[PDB]
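Re: your question from the hallway

Yes, I did run it. Sequences:
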Amino acid sequence: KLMMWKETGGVEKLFSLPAQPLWNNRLLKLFTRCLTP
Amino acid sequence: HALCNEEFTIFNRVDISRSQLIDELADKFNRLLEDFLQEGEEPDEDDAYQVLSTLKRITAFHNAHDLSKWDLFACNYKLLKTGIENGDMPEQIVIHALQCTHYVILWQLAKITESSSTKEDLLRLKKQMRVFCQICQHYLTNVNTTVKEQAFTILCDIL
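Structure:
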């Protein structure tokens, strides 16, 4: 769990990933396409 | 999901297996829910355990699998409505229902991209979205901290 949180705990990943974890790349795109510049 | 990649020549077999598993889970869920809510008398605890166990599997699979052909939005949304109306439902049941409904809404969107769907489907998605947010708000101001935490995450991502 701490290894994971070191993977994703960085704020750059914190501001580029969903809060509720979505595993499929389809739904990840559904979210991250709303991330503008 | 790792074994269901189309480019690999196993999709037929893995999809047959996927279909059987999800089918059994869906039939059991519907059958159990009919007696669960029932509007007629008081529910017990072992059947609540079974319902929670089945829902924990359907939710776990609806995060990477498109369980849309087995329309469940009616089941989950009905369950949540009885929960607001009575105010005695189990917390984990609320949490996993609130998760599975977010998943079904997200996949419904996933399918609105091909443009093969008529305007009726877009309006249906709007109707399901506004209904969901209303229920999530009430669950953002609940007594159970786990429930309120799950509400926040889901509402933020949906918005």
